[PDB]
Design a protein around this ligand. Structure first.
Ligand SMILES: [Mg+2]
Ligand SMILES: [Mg+2]
Ligand SMILES: [Mg+2]
Ligand SMILES: [Mg+2]
Ligand SMILES: [Mg+2]
Ligand SMILES: [Mg+2]
Ligand SMILES: [Mg+2]
Ligand SMILES: [Mg+2]
Ligand SMILES: [Mg+2]
Ligand SMILES: [Mg+2]
Ligand SMILES: [Mg+2]
Ligand SMILES: [Mg+2]
Ligand SMILES: [Mg+2]
Ligand SMILES: [Mg+2]
Ligand SMILES: [Mg+2]
Ligand SMILES: [Mg+2]
Ligand SMILES: [Mg+2]
Ligand SMILES: [Mg+2]
Ligand SMILES: [Mg+2]
Ligand SMILES: [Mg+2]
Ligand SMILES: [Mg+2]
Ligand SMILES: [Mg+2]
Lengths: 208, 294, 157, 169, 68
RNA sequence: GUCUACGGCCAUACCACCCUGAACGCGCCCGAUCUCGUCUGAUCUCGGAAGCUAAGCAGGGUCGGGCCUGGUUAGUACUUGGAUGGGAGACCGCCUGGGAAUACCGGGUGCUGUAGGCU
RNA sequence: GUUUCCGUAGUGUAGUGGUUAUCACGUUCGCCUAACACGCGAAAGGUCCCCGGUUCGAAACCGGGCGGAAACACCA
RNA sequence: CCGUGGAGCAGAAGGGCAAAAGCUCGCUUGAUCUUGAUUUUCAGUACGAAUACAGACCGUGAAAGCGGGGCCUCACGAUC
RNA sequence: ACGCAGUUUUAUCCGGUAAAGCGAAUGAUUAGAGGUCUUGGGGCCGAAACGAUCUCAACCUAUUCUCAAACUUUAAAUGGGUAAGAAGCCCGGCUCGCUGGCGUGGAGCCGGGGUGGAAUGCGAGUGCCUAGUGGGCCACUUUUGGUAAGCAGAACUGGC
């Protein structure tokens, strides 16, 4: 386990786990949702998300420790099934290690220069969302404090933003309450199906 | 619930071709039939297109340009009662007859009638058309089979033999004409002449008259509705070939106009389509208001 | 050290693009390739018998020889020393015309027509292609409405 | 009220899948010759088993296709053996049905002791006038939705002709 | 004792030191490399032009000079 | 206003389902004695013409799926050239120029050449 | 660390020149014996290291890991 | 019945291919002899490989045409 | 007057990188919902019963999260080739053993008529002989290996 000071801002092309890598071990994170996974859309109105500022690489172990800290503060503040946290970020870039000393100069110079896979990190663009927590209206400050506790644990500088959208959907919270009732949006689990008007008439007849 | 039938199949479906989806071309043989070698730069390559359809055969000569295909001459089977062959429009005799009419009409269009008489006395031999020095050269055309399987006895070869005896210098072999034996490699010109004149179906009409008069009246009906007897068929095609070779000029039809026209239904407009949708919306809302209460 | 074989960089270049696979169209063949025709080179993936090279894709040359079912084109290829006129034999499926010479012949025909009109009527024509001139002292119109005032917007994430 | 859209017998398939090649397979071909009056045609691999001793490219099955009045006669013999009692899962969704029989001497064959008892598959497809479009070489067109033969059409045809019983159990 | 392997630096400048040249001068293009059947056309056409062009072209030039 | 034969552009013209088709034509169909090739006249060939538009086919329709085109995305993401611009870096801002795409929305869905025939 | 080789019933192995579960010891049952050793006849016992790709078909051909066995690791 | 390439084309991949370059069947050795040109690597030298021609003798096909090895990218060798 | 250009414009073709996308093919990958053919774990109606009920399993449908140097429908900026005339147009005629329905096509040859045919800059073309060189380095930018290096290796331009 090498420090995160030597694996930082992007200096290589993305090298994913594929047909040509074949040697990367398992990532640290395996799951990506921690809260009420079966939460409906009208249950938790708002969401606060965590916006990066530096074009950096976040490691999977950092994502692990941050989601554990955020989950722990959420279950100590609003308890189980009072929140829904989703790590938006998924690690795919495989960093490499060129290890030596396997106190001698008589084993290997820079002869075999290409390295073996060490672990998985995640290339993060400027403005790309790290995490997103949807909660009730009364849990506004708790999401702020949870992502603030994750802020001290991610490297680099990043900000927090309470979204204008209604949860994880791409539609506005101002338009949601006035527009899901009349015509368009129908809830489908935790996601929302948006229907256009360019359908067959059997869909409109199945509605109403 | 089972299959993933058609999701992006329509979006990645490379359509083949208009004529291939209609099923009228192949293009793997058309790319070799049509395209002239480029040491000529303008010389058209003439193709006799012989298409057999139910009730009618079509014999044409065409070449190609970048805009489409240019047809110089064309002869049909429904024009044979103008030459004498009233009934039997798709027999091998009509194939030979349409090929002869096509060749005579092409040579009448080109003015090469007095020269290149061809094979007047129909014998069924291997009469290759030779060119004469000091005179305009022979017409070099090539066959088109289309999608028909060219086994021995196909009447596209009968139209070929009609064009060759009319005087079109088309290269051909004698091992796909009817009457060619398969085991013995020799060719039977008497059987080929018999099959041109149509004496085999004369023998089959004799067979039906001597075996089953009920079948002889069930099929072959229009024959005895006007008149068909085998000696008059043997004289009938013999006079029809002479009528073609004496008058191939193809008189046409006037066809001014008949100024009365409504058969097909035109399209409806965008506003009409949208108002159909609006009437459907209003009628469904009216039904949901009315029938749920009543 | 790149193992410079034939077509070692042609994963995308000699490929039929999208929704255009299958048999070759016949209007590619049915073209008039005389001598002096300024023609382009664009390689094909269907016909493998006449690929020019990976270096001559997209270039433009002059026809010197025509055969049964190919053509001969002289192409200026740039090498380390200096550009060279090279004599290539390319089949017909890989070749289309160039319309720049056709536009120049259209301009020559228009200039001959204007010169005929000039000799007829004594009218000066200015048949030289002058480039895009500076804008003249034209006169704008602002009737009916005042000009709309634009201001930059505040920053919102 | 129904212009020339008649549910007629298109063909009748006859199949015997012998577990080996040689004497029993040749005698099964002899049985199909005794039914049809014409020679059968053999089958082969695209599988290699190793559970009972056959290999790739061996004569596993014999089969034949009978069309016309002979097909109607052999269909009558098969429904006479089964006594006109099919089952509801015999009819396929494409309008075709098969049933199969054992004890081939029930078809009207004098039992030779050297041949033995071979079972025989009977598979019938239903045809309408206008099904040669999907088989002719020139213009292979589709059939259509209102013209294709379905499950209900096939079972109502079998209720109408030959006086059959569905046995829905 | 490892050395620098390969580069193309300071190469285009050496190319443009002497002014990269089009061949730029081919009037009456070179005739070799053309179809021998077309050569059997053209050479026999040229030598029978040398033989039998005299009197018809001479009288035609006299006719067009008299009409011009 | 159409169709047939050969086509050019290759989905504005493919796929699913439902209606319409007067007259030539296309077809389904009607049988193996010759030419023919098959286990099977099912496919391919041979002389038909008793019915039929049920199918192909040709039109129209689906708040149809796809395809083409136009707005939006967006003067955004990118980007030639420049600075003794900012910042520890990460990168970002400015001058001069060029400028894309998915979502979202709207419209169309064949055009024609040659030869021939129907109203 | 590098280069070769191996992994198969509880144990040591054979077997690919692709399409088996092979031998020997051990266990259980029964016999000979008064009873044991010895001997006999059967039976059970296999993830052919684990996970993937090639094909009609893999343990076999190949790859990534796992655990081992040999050889080298020298001059300053 | 659905089935636009999701199979196959000798092998490592890329490209390409559907009345096909794929599978099956029937005949055949054009995988023949010979002089030049051109492309590739390149110094515009050679070998190797390839392309379009030309002249004989042929194969197939009804003919159009196709074929002087393998659908293309490699699978090979100077003086004496 | 001809000609030339590390330049631009006007047209004309070429590409598949940045970007973007994967509710689009290939490859990965997250979560919830709806549907019911399927075999497999449970208890429940109960002599057993695809006679019937709930859930998990898997599949399908419509969504949704995140990517791809060896993925891609789309597709830049930058860049590459070509043309911008008198060596070019147009007319009339001879030759051909090439080709061929045709004085058909195509090449060659002869004669005649009209140069004011994008911007800016510049006087060009060509022959011979030969030294030195064949150890490089640095910088803005685009980049490969490496944690990084005043490290090693590439591209354009400039400099030592
Ligand atoms: Mg063919
Ligand atoms: Mg060096
Ligand atoms: Mg017979
Ligand atoms: Mg026969
Ligand atoms: Mg029949
Ligand atoms: Mg119809
Ligand atoms: Mg109808
Ligand atoms: Mg339509
Ligand atoms: Mg639509
Ligand atoms: Mg900059
Ligand atoms: Mg089908
Ligand atoms: Mg491949
Ligand atoms: Mg491919
Ligand atoms: Mg073929
Ligand atoms: Mg030859
Ligand atoms: Mg590339
Ligand atoms: Mg990218
Ligand atoms: Mg010196
Ligand atoms: Mg030195
Ligand atoms: Mg360096
Ligand atoms: Mg150094
Ligand atoms: Mg200096």
């Amino acid at each position: 386990r090498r420090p995160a000071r030597c694996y930082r801002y992007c200096k290589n092309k993305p090298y994913p786990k594929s047909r040509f890598c074949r040697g990367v071990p398992d990532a640290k994170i395996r799951i990506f949702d921690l809260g009420r996974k079966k939460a409906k859309v009208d249950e938790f109105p708002l969401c606060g998300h965590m916006v990066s500022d530096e074009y950096e690489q976040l490691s999977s172990e950092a994502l692990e420790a941050a989601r554990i800290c955020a989950n722990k503060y959420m279950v100590k503040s609003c308890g189980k099934d009072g929140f829904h946290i989703r790590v938006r970020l998924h690690p795919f870039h495989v960093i490499r290690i060129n290890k030596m000393l396997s106190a001698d100069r008589l084993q290997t110079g820079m002869r075999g220069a290409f390295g073996k896979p060490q672990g998985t990190v995640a290339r993060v663009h400027i403005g790309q969302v790290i995490m997103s927590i949807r909660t009730k209206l009364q849990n506004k400050e708790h999401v702020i404090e949870a992502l603030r506790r994750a802020k001290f644990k991610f490297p680099g500088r990043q900000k927090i933003h309470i979204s204008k959208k209604w949860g994880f959907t791409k539609f506005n919270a101002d338009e949601f309450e006035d527009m899901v009732a009349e015509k368009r949006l129908i809830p489908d689990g935790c996601g929302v199906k948006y229907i256009p008007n360019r359908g067959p008439l059997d869909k409109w007849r199945a509605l109403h | 619930v089972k299959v993933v039938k058609n999701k992006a199949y329509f979006k990645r479906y490379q359509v083949k071709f208009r004529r291939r989806r209609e099923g009228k071309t192949d293009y793997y043989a058309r790319k070799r039939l049509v395209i002239q070698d480029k040491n000529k730069y303008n010389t058209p390559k003439y193709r006799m297109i012989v298409r057999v359809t139910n009730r009618d055969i079509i014999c044409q000569i065409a070449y190609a340009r970048i805009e489409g295909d240019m047809i110089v001459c064309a002869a049909y089977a429904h024009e044979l009662p103008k030459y004498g062959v009233k009934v039997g429009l798709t027999n091998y005799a009509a194939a030979y007859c349409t090929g002869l009419l096509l060749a005579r009409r092409l040579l009448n269009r080109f003015g090469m009638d007095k020269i290149y008489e061809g094979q007047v006395e129909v014998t069924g031999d291997e009469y290759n058309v030779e060119s004469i020095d000091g005179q305009p050269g022979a017409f070099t055309c090539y066959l088109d089979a289309g999608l028909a399987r060219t086994t021995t006895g196909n009447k596209v070869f009968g139209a070929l033999k009609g064009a060759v005896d009319g005087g079109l210098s088309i290269p051909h072999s004698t091992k796909r004409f009817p009457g060619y034996d398969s085991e013995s490699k020799e060719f039977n010109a008497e059987v080929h002449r018999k099959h041109i004149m149509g004496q085999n179906v004369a023998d089959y009409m004799r067979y039906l008259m001597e075996e089953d008069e009920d079948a002889y009246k069930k099929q072959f009906s229009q024959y005895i509705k006007n008149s068909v007897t085998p000696d008059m068929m043997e004289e009938m095609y013999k006079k029809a070939h002479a009528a073609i070779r004496e008058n191939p000029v193809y008189e046409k039809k006037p066809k001014k106009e008949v100024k009365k026209k409504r058969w097909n239904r035109p399209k409806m407009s965008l506003a009409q389509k949208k108002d159909r949708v609006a009437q459907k919306k209003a009628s469904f809302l009216r039904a949901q208001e009315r029938a749920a209460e009543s | 050290t790149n193992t410079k074989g034939k077509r070692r960089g042609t994963r995308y270049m000699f490929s039929r693009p999208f929704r255009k696979h299958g048999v070759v169209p016949l209007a590619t063949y049915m073209r008039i390739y005389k001598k002096g025709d300024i023609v382009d080179i664009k390689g094909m993936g269907t016909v493998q018998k006449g690929m020019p090279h990976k270096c001559y894709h997209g270039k433009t040359g002059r026809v010197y020889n025509v055969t049964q079912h190919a053509v001969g084109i002289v192409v200026n290829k740039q090498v380390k020393g200096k550009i060279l006129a090279k004599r290539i034999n390319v089949r017909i499926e890989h070749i289309k015309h160039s319309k720049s010479r056709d536009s120049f012949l259209k301009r020559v025909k228009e200039n001959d027509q204007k010169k005929k009109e000039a000799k007829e009527k004594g009218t000066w024509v200015q048949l030289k292609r002058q480039p895009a001139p500076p804008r003249e002292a034209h006169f704008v119109r602002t009737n009916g409405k005042e000009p709309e005032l634009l201001e930059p917007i505040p920053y919102e994430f | 009220e129904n212009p020339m859209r008649e549910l007629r017998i298109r063909k009748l398939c006859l199949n015997i899948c012998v577990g080996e090649s040689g004497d029993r397979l040749t005698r099964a071909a002899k049985v199909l010759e005794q039914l049809t009056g014409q020679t059968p045609v053999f089958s082969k691999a695209r599988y290699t088993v190793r559970s009972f001793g056959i290999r790739r490219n061996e004569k596993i099955a014999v089969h034949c296709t009978v069309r016309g009045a002979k097909a109607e006669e052999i269909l009558e013999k098969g429904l006479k053996v089964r006594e006109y009692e099919l089952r509801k899962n015999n009819f396929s969704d494409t309008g075709n049905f098969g049933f199969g029989i054992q004890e081939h001497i029930d078809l009207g064959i004098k039992y030779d002791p050297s041949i033995g008892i071979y079972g025989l598959d009977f598979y019938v497809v239903l045809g309408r006038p206008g099904f040669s479009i999907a088989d002719k070489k020139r213009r292979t067109g589709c059939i259509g939705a209102k013209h294709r033969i379905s499950k209900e059409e096939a079972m109502r045809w079998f209720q109408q002709k030959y006086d059959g019983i569905i046995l829905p159990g | 004792a490892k050395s620098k392997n390969h580069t193309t630096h300071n190469q285009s400048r050496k190319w443009h030191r002497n002014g990269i040249k089009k061949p730029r001068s081919q009037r009456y293009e070179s005739l070799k490399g053309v179809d021998p059947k077309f050569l059997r056309n053209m050479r026999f056409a040229k030598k029978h032009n040398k033989k039998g062009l005299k009197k018809m072209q001479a009288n035609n030039a006299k006719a067009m000079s008299a009409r011009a």
